[PDB]
Amino acid sequence: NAMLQKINRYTHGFVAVPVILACREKGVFELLADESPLSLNQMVEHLGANSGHFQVALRMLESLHWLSRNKELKYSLTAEAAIHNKISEDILQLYNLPIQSYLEGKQGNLLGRWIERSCQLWNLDNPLMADFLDGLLVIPLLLALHKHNLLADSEDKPLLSSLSSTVQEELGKLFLHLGWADLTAGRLTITELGRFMGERALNTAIVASYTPMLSRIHDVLFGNCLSVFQRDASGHERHIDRTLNVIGSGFQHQKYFADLEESILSVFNQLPLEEQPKYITDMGCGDGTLLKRVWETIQFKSARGKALEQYPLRLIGVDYNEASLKATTRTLASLPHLVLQGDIGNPEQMVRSLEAHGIHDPENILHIRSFLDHDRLFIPPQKRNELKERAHLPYQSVCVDDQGELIPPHVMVQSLVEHLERWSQVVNKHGLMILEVHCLEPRVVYQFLDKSENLHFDAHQGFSQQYLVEAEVFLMSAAQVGLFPKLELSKRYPKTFPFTRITLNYFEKRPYKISHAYLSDLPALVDLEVKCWPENLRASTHEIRRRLELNPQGNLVLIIEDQIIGAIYSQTITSTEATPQGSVIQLLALNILPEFQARGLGNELRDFMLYYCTLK
Ligand SMILES: [Mn+2]
């Protein structure tokens, strides 16, 4: 895990370096030295920038602690940004080197001078930034080496044995400098780090697939972004190498697929075999690996796996891309299966396509999906009054429309709620299992800079017009449309740190909603105090009104008939007197109408609130 840290620095630099160089040459850092505290729009106007893409770049610089952002939302330089002058722009040549030919012995001493500058730490006094620049050298080469498994043991043929004398010599120097090899027994031999790097090479396939977009990021930020992102004459994407991207998604999503085992077993060990689903529909099936791995868990480890004849099961793969449809059919050629054109954004049309293929009982479907709700077509929000209720919440996401302009976070969140509302209307008693990936706040990304992927991942999702939100905002959006996690099956990653980047939730429909408490709700929250406490132990309308304005996202409400049945308030005060910890006051106040206690709604609200607080 202290080796993933090295990989993480490489993938960070792969994205960060061209963003840094584009901003430098446009004048971003000079502008902030001349005029300081500037808002986003002040900089957009001075630079002629695309405001959405430029906000993605600002978030990344804040996450490096190169910029700070004040309470008026105005940016200024920090002292760490000064290293930006030392970076040489010709490093950008590494994105197009012909690495495969070089490994074939057909390009001479191509990497010699780059490897020498890496041995000098790129003439920076900053080892961290030297690692960032190393990523532009390492990642294309790692992927090329993985092609032919060149970065592997003395499997009767020693380390660099199959290559030309020139490339043995240049790669031998790099590997020894990176710690990928050592001189055991007088020969060049792989180390643990070098074996680890070869095995994990495909973790870098996703940032590498964005190379066309990254080598044009000047135009994304400051030019006609549409000459990027516009599609082929054959209809393929130009900002990305989609076939390498999918190979990368697949390799990386595997370790989360296995953790779906407990949820899948809980469904197919469920007592009456007759009440189990008849179909498993994976929306965004890609290459079909998740459906295959699911099918094998059921066949060989579940009760239903012993009753496939009385109780047939059929896998259904939905995807928008023709190539994924063809790939899934091959992966699932041995299994009972159906494959359909369809879209994450249109679950009703998926239901209509299922009928055309003979499936008229969609109430017997278990729905699953991984890493796809963020990659949907933006549909602007249509519930205008609901949009205005949430306009004051401090959401911390960044999303770009197809004109390069910033989508306001509350508009994006209202659009996610309407998207999950469409899904809740086709979900049935068997529920909906979702793996999803989330963004973080810049202050948190810097504190854990090389413990997580967010610095580069959140950037290239932002640039490519995909829509990440915080773990707990996704959770709150499902609950506002009546979908709730089965808490004992949920998982959050990374398990060992106080932030959440990935969530696994098996959502369940329930006959209520959970929402934030707003100011319009204040009468009903006052009455809830009268109905829940004796007159001496009641909170004051002053106190309650405080809680709604200090912590608008710290107070949850359970609604039934447009009636507020219960409310829960969390508040924490830290003393202002003078990693370690000082004087604090912590308060958690649950109100539930006597009417509804026996059903346990108090328990369900309290338990939801504790998991929401853990995701935060
Ligand atoms: Mn994505």
Tab-separated table of N, CA, C and O in Angstrom, residues 28-90:
chain	number	residue	atom	x	y	z
A	28	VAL	N	-1.986	32.415	-16.194
A	28	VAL	CA	-2.832	32.309	-15.004
A	28	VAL	C	-2.068	32.736	-13.765
A	28	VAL	O	-2.574	33.497	-12.935
A	29	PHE	N	-0.835	32.264	-13.629
A	29	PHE	CA	-0.052	32.552	-12.435
A	29	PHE	C	0.437	33.992	-12.397
A	29	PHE	O	0.583	34.557	-11.308
A	30	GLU	N	0.693	34.599	-13.561
A	30	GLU	CA	1.056	36.015	-13.593
A	30	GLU	C	-0.130	36.877	-13.217
A	30	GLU	O	0.025	37.891	-12.528
A	31	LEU	N	-1.315	36.507	-13.706
A	31	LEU	CA	-2.514	37.271	-13.409
A	31	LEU	C	-2.740	37.344	-11.910
A	31	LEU	O	-3.006	38.417	-11.358
A	32	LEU	N	-2.588	36.212	-11.224
A	32	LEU	CA	-2.797	36.168	-9.785
A	32	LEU	C	-1.692	36.866	-8.999
A	32	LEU	O	-1.919	37.240	-7.847
A	33	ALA	N	-0.507	37.051	-9.579
A	33	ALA	CA	0.479	37.897	-8.914
A	33	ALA	C	0.150	39.384	-9.065
A	33	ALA	O	0.395	40.165	-8.141
A	34	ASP	N	-0.447	39.785	-10.189
A	34	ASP	CA	-0.760	41.192	-10.423
A	34	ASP	C	-2.006	41.645	-9.669
A	34	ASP	O	-2.052	42.769	-9.159
A	35	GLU	N	-3.052	40.825	-9.651
A	35	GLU	CA	-4.301	41.165	-8.987
A	35	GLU	C	-4.731	39.976	-8.142
A	35	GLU	O	-4.761	38.840	-8.634
A	36	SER	N	-5.065	40.221	-6.886
A	36	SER	CA	-5.265	39.055	-6.041
A	36	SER	C	-6.502	39.214	-5.169
A	36	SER	O	-6.977	40.337	-4.987
A	37	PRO	N	-6.889	38.174	-4.444
A	37	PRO	CA	-8.234	37.611	-4.578
A	37	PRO	C	-8.955	37.917	-5.886
A	37	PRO	O	-9.514	38.998	-6.045
A	38	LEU	N	-9.003	36.933	-6.787
A	38	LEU	CA	-9.881	36.932	-7.953
A	38	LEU	C	-10.897	35.793	-7.898
A	38	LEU	O	-10.531	34.648	-7.663
A	39	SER	N	-12.150	36.087	-8.211
A	39	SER	CA	-13.120	35.010	-8.381
A	39	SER	C	-12.895	34.262	-9.701
A	39	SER	O	-12.165	34.705	-10.599
A	40	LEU	N	-13.568	33.115	-9.815
A	40	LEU	CA	-13.614	32.375	-11.073
A	40	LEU	C	-13.968	33.278	-12.256
A	40	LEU	O	-13.257	33.294	-13.269
A	41	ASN	N	-15.090	34.005	-12.161
A	41	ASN	CA	-15.560	34.795	-13.298
A	41	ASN	C	-14.630	35.957	-13.625
A	41	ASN	O	-14.497	36.316	-14.799
A	42	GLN	N	-13.992	36.558	-12.622
A	42	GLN	CA	-12.982	37.583	-12.902
A	42	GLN	C	-11.833	37.020	-13.728
A	42	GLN	O	-11.326	37.688	-14.644
A	43	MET	N	-11.393	35.800	-13.403
A	43	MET	CA	-10.330	35.164	-14.166
A	43	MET	C	-10.822	34.721	-15.541
A	43	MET	O	-10.119	34.900	-16.541
A	44	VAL	N	-12.033	34.168	-15.615
A	44	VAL	CA	-12.606	33.773	-16.901
A	44	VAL	C	-12.648	34.967	-17.852
A	44	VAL	O	-12.261	34.870	-19.019
A	45	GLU	N	-13.122	36.115	-17.362
A	45	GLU	CA	-13.225	37.297	-18.209
A	45	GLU	C	-11.855	37.806	-18.635
A	45	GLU	O	-11.666	38.181	-19.795
A	46	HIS	N	-10.882	37.817	-17.723
A	46	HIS	CA	-9.565	38.317	-18.095
A	46	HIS	C	-8.862	37.375	-19.060
A	46	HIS	O	-8.150	37.825	-19.962
A	47	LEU	N	-9.038	36.066	-18.885
A	47	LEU	CA	-8.305	35.087	-19.670
A	47	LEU	C	-9.042	34.619	-20.908
A	47	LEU	O	-8.454	33.888	-21.715
A	48	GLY	N	-10.308	34.983	-21.067
A	48	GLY	CA	-11.144	34.367	-22.074
A	48	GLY	C	-11.267	32.857	-21.945
A	48	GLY	O	-11.070	32.139	-22.924
A	49	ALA	N	-11.601	32.346	-20.767
A	49	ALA	CA	-11.585	30.911	-20.543
A	49	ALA	C	-12.987	30.303	-20.631
A	49	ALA	O	-13.998	31.002	-20.592
A	50	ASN	N	-13.025	28.970	-20.761
A	50	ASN	CA	-14.256	28.192	-20.656
A	50	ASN	C	-14.504	27.926	-19.172
A	50	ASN	O	-13.716	27.241	-18.522
A	51	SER	N	-15.582	28.496	-18.624
A	51	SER	CA	-15.666	28.644	-17.180
A	51	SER	C	-15.752	27.285	-16.485
A	51	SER	O	-15.201	27.097	-15.396
A	52	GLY	N	-16.433	26.325	-17.095
A	52	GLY	CA	-16.548	25.017	-16.458
A	52	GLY	C	-15.218	24.293	-16.435
A	52	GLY	O	-14.755	23.844	-15.390
A	53	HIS	N	-14.575	24.196	-17.591
A	53	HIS	CA	-13.261	23.583	-17.645
A	53	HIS	C	-12.270	24.321	-16.770
A	53	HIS	O	-11.492	23.685	-16.057
A	54	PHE	N	-12.342	25.657	-16.724
A	54	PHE	CA	-11.382	26.393	-15.896
A	54	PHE	C	-11.625	26.139	-14.415
A	54	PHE	O	-10.676	26.045	-13.640
A	55	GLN	N	-12.888	25.988	-14.001
A	55	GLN	CA	-13.147	25.612	-12.614
A	55	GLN	C	-12.590	24.229	-12.281
A	55	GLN	O	-12.178	23.999	-11.141
A	56	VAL	N	-12.598	23.287	-13.229
A	56	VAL	CA	-11.994	21.973	-12.980
A	56	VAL	C	-10.499	22.135	-12.709
A	56	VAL	O	-9.928	21.512	-11.797
A	57	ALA	N	-9.852	23.024	-13.467
A	57	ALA	CA	-8.419	23.237	-13.293
A	57	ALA	C	-8.131	23.945	-11.979
A	57	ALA	O	-7.152	23.628	-11.299
A	58	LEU	N	-9.004	24.866	-11.575
A	58	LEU	CA	-8.805	25.557	-10.307
A	58	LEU	C	-8.931	24.589	-9.139
A	58	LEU	O	-8.182	24.673	-8.162
A	59	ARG	N	-9.881	23.670	-9.223
A	59	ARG	CA	-10.038	22.696	-8.155
A	59	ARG	C	-8.771	21.877	-8.001
A	59	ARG	O	-8.330	21.593	-6.881
A	60	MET	N	-8.169	21.501	-9.123
A	60	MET	CA	-6.959	20.691	-9.096
A	60	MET	C	-5.798	21.447	-8.464
A	60	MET	O	-5.039	20.880	-7.672
A	61	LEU	N	-5.654	22.731	-8.795
A	61	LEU	CA	-4.590	23.552	-8.209
A	61	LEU	C	-4.810	23.785	-6.718
A	61	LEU	O	-3.839	23.872	-5.949
A	62	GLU	N	-6.069	23.958	-6.299
A	62	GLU	CA	-6.372	24.041	-4.875
A	62	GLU	C	-6.026	22.738	-4.167
A	62	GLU	O	-5.505	22.750	-3.049
A	63	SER	N	-6.278	21.603	-4.814
A	63	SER	CA	-5.953	20.312	-4.230
A	63	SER	C	-4.458	20.062	-4.170
A	63	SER	O	-4.034	19.114	-3.507
A	64	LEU	N	-3.648	20.833	-4.886
A	64	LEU	CA	-2.208	20.724	-4.707
A	64	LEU	C	-1.695	21.710	-3.676
A	64	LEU	O	-0.489	21.744	-3.407
A	65	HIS	N	-2.594	22.502	-3.096
A	65	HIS	CA	-2.255	23.639	-2.236
A	65	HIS	C	-1.350	24.646	-2.966
A	65	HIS	O	-0.472	25.265	-2.359
A	66	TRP	N	-1.588	24.830	-4.280
A	66	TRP	CA	-1.018	25.939	-5.050
A	66	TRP	C	-1.877	27.188	-5.046
A	66	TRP	O	-1.350	28.284	-5.275
A	67	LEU	N	-3.187	27.043	-4.822
A	67	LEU	CA	-4.094	28.164	-4.665
A	67	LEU	C	-4.810	28.012	-3.340
A	67	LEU	O	-5.012	26.895	-2.865
A	68	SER	N	-5.198	29.133	-2.747
A	68	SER	CA	-6.161	29.101	-1.663
A	68	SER	C	-7.384	29.898	-2.093
A	68	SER	O	-7.307	30.761	-2.979
A	69	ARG	N	-8.526	29.567	-1.489
A	69	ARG	CA	-9.806	30.150	-1.871
A	69	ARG	C	-10.515	30.636	-0.616
A	69	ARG	O	-10.669	29.874	0.338
A	70	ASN	N	-10.907	31.918	-0.601
A	70	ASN	CA	-11.357	32.573	0.620
A	70	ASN	C	-12.883	32.460	0.736
A	70	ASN	O	-13.529	31.750	-0.032
A	71	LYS	N	-13.484	33.149	1.705
A	71	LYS	CA	-14.908	32.949	1.951
A	71	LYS	C	-15.784	33.692	0.954
A	71	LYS	O	-16.976	33.385	0.846
A	72	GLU	N	-15.227	34.664	0.229
A	72	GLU	CA	-15.934	35.252	-0.896
A	72	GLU	C	-15.779	34.428	-2.166
A	72	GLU	O	-16.299	34.830	-3.205
A	73	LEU	N	-15.079	33.297	-2.081
A	73	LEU	CA	-14.780	32.372	-3.170
A	73	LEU	C	-13.718	32.936	-4.109
A	73	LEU	O	-13.725	32.640	-5.310
A	74	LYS	N	-12.798	33.724	-3.581
A	74	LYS	CA	-11.768	34.344	-4.399
A	74	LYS	C	-10.437	33.637	-4.172
A	74	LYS	O	-10.118	33.248	-3.044
A	75	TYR	N	-9.683	33.439	-5.256
A	75	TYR	CA	-8.447	32.671	-5.244
A	75	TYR	C	-7.229	33.577	-5.104
A	75	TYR	O	-7.211	34.709	-5.594
A	76	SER	N	-6.183	33.037	-4.485
A	76	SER	CA	-4.891	33.697	-4.492
A	76	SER	C	-3.799	32.637	-4.480
A	76	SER	O	-4.039	31.486	-4.128
A	77	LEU	N	-2.585	33.033	-4.867
A	77	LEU	CA	-1.475	32.087	-4.876
A	77	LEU	C	-1.039	31.732	-3.459
A	77	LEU	O	-1.190	32.520	-2.524
A	78	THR	N	-0.495	30.524	-3.306
A	78	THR	CA	0.315	30.149	-2.150
A	78	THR	C	1.777	30.112	-2.579
A	78	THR	O	2.113	30.282	-3.755
A	79	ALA	N	2.650	29.825	-1.623
A	79	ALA	CA	4.070	29.757	-1.942
A	79	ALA	C	4.445	28.466	-2.654
A	79	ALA	O	5.484	28.414	-3.317
A	80	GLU	N	3.625	27.419	-2.563
A	80	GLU	CA	3.989	26.192	-3.269
A	80	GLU	C	3.889	26.361	-4.778
A	80	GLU	O	4.566	25.653	-5.529
A	81	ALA	N	3.058	27.288	-5.249
A	81	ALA	CA	2.907	27.444	-6.688
A	81	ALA	C	4.198	27.887	-7.365
A	81	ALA	O	4.316	27.750	-8.588
A	82	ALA	N	5.182	28.379	-6.608
A	82	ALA	CA	6.341	29.010	-7.243
A	82	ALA	C	7.148	28.016	-8.069
A	82	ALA	O	7.750	28.396	-9.075
A	83	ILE	N	7.144	26.737	-7.687
A	83	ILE	CA	7.805	25.703	-8.468
A	83	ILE	C	7.312	25.632	-9.910
A	83	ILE	O	7.965	25.001	-10.746
A	84	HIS	N	6.188	26.281	-10.236
A	84	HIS	CA	5.631	26.157	-11.583
A	84	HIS	C	6.569	26.686	-12.667
A	84	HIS	O	6.470	26.246	-13.816
A	85	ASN	N	7.498	27.584	-12.323
A	85	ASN	CA	8.464	28.097	-13.299
A	85	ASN	C	9.541	27.090	-13.644
A	85	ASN	O	10.159	27.187	-14.708
A	86	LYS	N	9.836	26.173	-12.740
A	86	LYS	CA	10.936	25.249	-12.955
A	86	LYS	C	10.589	24.117	-13.914
A	86	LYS	O	11.493	23.425	-14.379
A	87	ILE	N	9.314	23.904	-14.223
A	87	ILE	CA	8.922	22.772	-15.051
A	87	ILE	C	9.187	23.105	-16.505
A	87	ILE	O	8.751	24.152	-16.997
A	88	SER	N	9.867	22.208	-17.216
A	88	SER	CA	10.187	22.466	-18.615
A	88	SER	C	9.062	21.972	-19.513
A	88	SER	O	8.575	20.843	-19.365
A	89	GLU	N	8.661	22.832	-20.449
A	89	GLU	CA	7.525	22.552	-21.303
A	89	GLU	C	7.814	21.454	-22.316
A	89	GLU	O	6.876	20.886	-22.887
A	90	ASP	N	9.072	21.138	-22.568
A	90	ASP	CA	9.293	20.128	-23.582
A	90	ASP	C	8.986	18.727	-23.075
A	90	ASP	O	8.940	17.798	-23.888
